[PDB]
């Protein structure tokens, strides 16, 4: 509840309203462009979602290959697999560039619909989507689409537990953002995956912490 | 000099030169009779044309005499 004063906009409403803004990037006085108070929470939400989805996959191969489950194709470093050619790359069933354009073609559909639901809330439920026209209407906030598909189990029924789930999600997203930043950084001063860094820190911290390079 | 720059600059210069002459000791015992003013407009054009013409005549008379008489054809 500290490290800043709740000036005029961080009253306590949003999930994770710890009243932290020493610069004033949500201040509603000058809000046009991309830093209005309606785009910043959404951006934090989905950046945290992607960080939560990436900070697990960055370690998953390296930690699974230690259990001997996966064959020896799991690159112990998260970066020796395609994503950066010059430091090592793995050969998949296609060129990394045709994989890239296929990924962009599959993601354009996934992202333009979401953008149109943000800019036009009720839309994306009117135009006949090819094949099974699915009910993907903008059921409320553009960051919580609800729906019978984006909520398989309906976890969260009324306001209390739903708000608790939301604040848990934003906190885990911030943690995962910091985790992937740590991945990126300590992949440079060490030269090896993060799980190996944790193991070598568990070995002996007196001679293996950050103050050794 | 007399054809490009015009009077309103030189008069505003003389007006402070006269001040500087008046407000100095040991040199305000002397005194001008005719008030110093900048040359007139047509007078400036005339002086400029006279300079242009004298220079034009002289720098070519000198050249035509030196380049020829120095070789005599």
């Amino acid at each position: 509840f500290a490290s800043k004063q709740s000036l005029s906009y961080l009253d306590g409403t949003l999930p994770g309203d710890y009243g932290f803004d020493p610069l004033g990037l949500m201040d509603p006085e000058g809000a046009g462009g991309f830093i209005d108070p309606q785009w910043l929470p959404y951006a934090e939400i989905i950046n945290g979602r992607f960080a939560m989805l990436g900070a697990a996959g960055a370690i998953a191969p390296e930690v699974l290959g230690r259990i001997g489950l996966i064959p020896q194709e799991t690159a112990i470093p998260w970066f020796q697999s395609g994503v950066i050619p010059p430091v090592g790359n793995y050969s998949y069933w296609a060129d990394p560039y045709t994989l890239f354009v296929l990924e962009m073609a599959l993601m354009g559909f996934a992202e333009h619909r979401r953008a149109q639901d943000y800019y036009k809330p009720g839309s994306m439920g009117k135009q006949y989507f090819l094949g099974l026209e699915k009910f993907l209407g903008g059921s409320g906030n553009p960051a919580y689409p609800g729906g019978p598909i984006f909520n398989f189990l309906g976890f969260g029924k009324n306001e209390k537990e739903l708000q608790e789930l939301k604040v848990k999600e934003v906190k885990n997203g911030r943690l995962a953002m910091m985790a992937v930043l740590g991945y990126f950084t300590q992949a440079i001063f060490t030269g090896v995956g993060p799980f190996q860094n944790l193991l070598d820190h568990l070995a002996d911290p007196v001679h293996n912490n950050v103050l050794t390079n | 000099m007399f054809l490009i720059s015009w009077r309103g600059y030189w008069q505003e210069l003389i007006e402070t030169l006269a001040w500087a002459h008046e407000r100095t000791p040991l040199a305000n015992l002397v005194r001008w009779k005719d008030k110093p003013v900048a040359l007139s407009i047509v007078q400036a054009r005339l002086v400029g044309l006279a300079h242009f013409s004298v220079g034009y005549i002289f720098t070519y008379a000198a050249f035509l005499i030196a380049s020829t008489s120095g070789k005599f054809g």
Binding site: G30, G32, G33 | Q11, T16
Partner: protein, 742 residues
């Protein structure tokens, strides 16, 4: 306090204001009755503070115009890089930089101009460039045309980006006046962010890629066998082969034991003995120091985080006895007027350009730069002209501010008021010192000319007759020559070779630099420089001070900044505004800079450059005839103009033909300027009537009545043509001389 301020979508982007040509100003938005509408349209097309009156729209327009200018500069840079990539003999130049003339432009064969593609070497045919881009790319570590192509594309991207921003911040998200006024945070971010982080990033690039590649280029290896600039990033061992200090990792920097970085972070004067340029191991250290300097200097001014200075308590605190109420009321001047900022910025940027032009020739920072004489002369002349233009612009904008932004109801703060209240003294003393300098500088030349004409050279002011040795410059030279032993114990050598100390350095024949002597011929020309600079300051300062009122016209500020004259009365009041003082000062700036560049050209060709042979014998280009022949105007006529002008005139039928053509073209333009500079509007307006008569006689009378150019546009056209002709003549002469004989 300090925050982001934006007004969402203040102007709808459309084409409506685009179809109506005159739209910004309502006085000429109606339509072109006469033909003096087409002219003033372009005249006040950029007069943002004249169309409207609120500082907010003016500031937004200024911002977007800056973005457009940046986009144009990015297009220019990407074009230069693409030309260096596609139509340049760069790779061939890299294999032999001492026998291959740079060239990055080719000409289509259409009408016989094919001969402009001269034989520059390396199997190439094209115009020989003098921009110095090849040396810059060699110093950057660029070693392949590919590495150019990419960056070209890069530039293009930024161009588009800039354009986008330029649109965005005017049409979608434009700030409001209260945002631009935060000068404290603006200076904080330009010091710490733009200059500090920029210098740090360039020091990083240097220390990582530019040092090993250039060192391997100095060791004589093929530019194709040199590893790529990333093999030194992902292999600290391949880089430590040259500078083994890298083997110690990033530990010395963090334990303050970084005195072991003396391999690549050096402090050594002089030039590299094989490239004739500075040590890149020295420029890396320089940039590393400058970066932290600007970074710690970017924390001075107060933001919304409690600490820091405020540039209003700093100003008011300086208020002495002699100077009234001190610097009070100047923070209100430089945050509510765009002109009082443009004046200071233009003055400082022009002076800085002059400093750059003086430093670069004396301490060549790029490899094989001091060897190529054409590049080293063009980089001096161009920058000198740029600075000379910028200072006059500063004067003009200070005059504009004084004319239509100054007001006394708040300027009772006796600093600007006090200097305004003794202008009749300031200008009088400046006039006296200008006269004194003019006499005691030019009369000496006239004395020398008359004596050498009267067969009595013993009465001249030469170095054999009565001497005028500049003792202070000689003492400064001798002091800097001994600095690395007493006043700079860690620097291995003096900062430059132009100081009397040191010795000569060769780059394979032609000489790079050597100690420069200073005799009477230098005393005279330095005093002439001082005199011309003083006269220019006289004109510009007189205009600026008398921009508001004078004894002749007490209400000149009502007339405005730009107006021809207040009648033929009071004897005559032609050319009485500040615009006319800028018009008059442009010519003296031209005179001064032309004298400076002539000085530099002759002195360098006479006492610096040349081609040394074995056993040490060095013969300069002209033969050291500057100390003796530059003391008389006749010497500047024959030994400099007549002698050195013998290359351009007879360049017909050669690869240097365009210079010979542009010589006469610029002469024609200069002489054409005199028609506008000497004549007046009335004669031409009358003559036009007798042509309109012939037109009416045949029913071809235009509806836009042909009026003649205004009294101010005539002067503008005259000075523009004059400057173009003069500078282009000197351009052609200098290039056609130095390309052939250098």
């Amino acid at each position: 306090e300090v925050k982001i301020m934006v007004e969402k979508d203040p102007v709808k982007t459309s084409f409506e204001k685009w179809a109506k040509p005159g739209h910004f100003s309502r006085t000429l938005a109606k339509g072109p009755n006469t033909t003096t509408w087409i002219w003033n349209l372009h005249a006040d097309a950029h007069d943002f503070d004249s169309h409207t009156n609120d500082l907010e729209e003016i500031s937004r327009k200024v911002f977007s115009a800056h973005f457009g200018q940046l986009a144009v500069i990015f297009i220019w840079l990407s074009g230069m890089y693409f030309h260096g990539a596609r139509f340049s003999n760069y790779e061939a130049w890299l294999s032999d930089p001492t026998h291959i003339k740079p060239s990055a432009q080719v000409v289509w064969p259409i009408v016989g101009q094919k001969i402009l593609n001269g034989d520059v070497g390396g199997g190439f045919q094209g115009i020989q460039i003098t921009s110095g881009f090849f040396q810059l790319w060699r110093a950057s570590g660029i070693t392949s045309e590919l590495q150019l192509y990419t960056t070209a594309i890069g530039g293009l991207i930024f161009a588009a980006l800039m354009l986008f921003a330029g649109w965005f911040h005017y049409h979608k998200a434009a700030p409001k006046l209260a945002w631009f006024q935060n000068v404290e945070s603006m200076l904080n971010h330009h010091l710490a962010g733009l200059l500090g982080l920029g210098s740090l990033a360039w020091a990083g690039h240097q220390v990582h890629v530019s040092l090993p590649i250039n060192r391997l280029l100095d060791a004589g290896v093929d530019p194709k066998e040199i590893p790529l600039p990333h093999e030194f990033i992902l292999n600290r061992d391949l880089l430590a082969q040259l500078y083994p200090s890298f083997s110690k990792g990033l530990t010395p920097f963090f334990t303050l034991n970084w005195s072991e970085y003396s391999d690549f972070l050096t402090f050594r004067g002089g030039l590299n003995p094989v490239t004739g340029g500075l040590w890149l191991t020295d420029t890396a250290h320089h940039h590393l120091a400058i970066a932290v300097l600007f970074l710690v200097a970017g924390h001075m001014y107060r933001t919304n985080f409690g600490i820091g200075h405020s540039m209003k308590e700093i100003l008011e605190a300086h208020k002495g006895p002699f100077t009234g109420e001190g610097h009070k009321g100047l923070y209100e001047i430089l945050t509510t007027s765009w002109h009082a900022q443009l004046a200071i910025n233009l003055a400082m940027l022009g002076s800085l350009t002059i400093i750059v032009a003086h430093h670069m020739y004396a301490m060549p920072p790029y490899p094989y730069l001091a060897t190529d004489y054409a590049t080293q002369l063009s980089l001096f002349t161009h920058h000198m002209w740029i600075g000379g233009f910028l200072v006059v612009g500063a004067a003009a904008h200070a005059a504009i501010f004084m004319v239509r932004d100054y007001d006394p109801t708040t300027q009772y703060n006796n600093l600007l008021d006090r200097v305004l209240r003794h202008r009749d003294a300031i200008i009088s003393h400046l006039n006296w010192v200008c006269i004194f300098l003019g006499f005691h500088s030019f009369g000496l030349y006239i004395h020398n000319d008359t004596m050498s004409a009267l067969g009595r050279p013993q009465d001249m002011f030469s170095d054999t007759a009565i001497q005028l040795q500049p003792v202070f410059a000689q003492w400064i030279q001798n002091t800097h020559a001994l600095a690395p032993s007493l006043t700079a114990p860690n620097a291995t050598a003096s900062t430059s070779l132009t100081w009397g100390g040191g010795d000569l350095v060769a780059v394979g024949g032609k000489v790079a630099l050597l100690p420069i002597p200073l005799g009477t011929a230098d005393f005279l020309v330095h005093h002439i420089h001082a005199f011309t600079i003083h006269v220019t300051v006289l004109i510009l300062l007189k205009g600026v001070l008398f921009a508001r009122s004078s004894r002749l016209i007490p209400d000149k500020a009502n007339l405005g900044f730009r107006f021809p004259c207040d009648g033929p009365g009071r004897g005559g009041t032609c050319q009485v505004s500040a615009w006319d003082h800028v018009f008059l000062g442009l010519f003296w700036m031209y005179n001064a800079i032309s004298v400076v560049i002539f000085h530099f050209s002759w002195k360098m060709q006479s006492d610096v450059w040349g081609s040394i042979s074995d056993q040490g014998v060095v013969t300069h280009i002209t033969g050291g005839n500057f100390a003796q022949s530059s003391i008389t105007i006749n010497g500047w006529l024959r030994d400099f103009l007549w002698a050195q002008a013998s290359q351009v005139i007879q360049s017909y039928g050669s690869s240097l033909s365009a210079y010979g053509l542009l010589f006469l073209g610029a002469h024609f333009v200069w002489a054409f300027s005199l028609m506008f500079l000497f004549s007046g509007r009335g004669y031409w307006q009358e003559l036009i009537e007798s042509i309109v008569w012939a037109h009416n006689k045949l029913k071809v009378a235009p509806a836009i009545q042909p009026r003649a150019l205004s009294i101010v546009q005539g002067r503008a056209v005259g000075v523009a043509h004059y400057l173009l002709g003069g500078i282009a003549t000197t351009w052609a002469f200098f290039l056609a001389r130095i390309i052939s004989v250098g």
